Amino acid sequence: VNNTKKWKMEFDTRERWENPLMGWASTADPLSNLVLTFSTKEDAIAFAEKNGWSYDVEERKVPKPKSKSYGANFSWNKRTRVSTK
């Protein structure tokens, strides 16, 4: 989960077409490889507003806390018994 720590700013992907000679992926978008890295969301929004970029923001998705019990795998009367191990 170490790549999920920082806020990124990317852009909309524009056209990538085929090179007539070699079949390579040609582009005309200069900002197609431009990915920035921010410590917080607010730094990212301030940088986007400072540069006049229209932005939209997804909130951070953290995994919810789970109730892990190794004893639940061997219960007396619950469906959460494992059939094998």
Binding site: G71, F74, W76, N77
Partner: peptide, 17 residues
């Protein structure tokens, strides 16, 4: 296959008992 400890068998043993 051995279960891990804890749970010990006095808590969760055979059939969950």
């Amino acid at each position: 296959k051995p279960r891990l400890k804890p749970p010990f068998p006095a808590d969760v043993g055979v059939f969950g008992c």
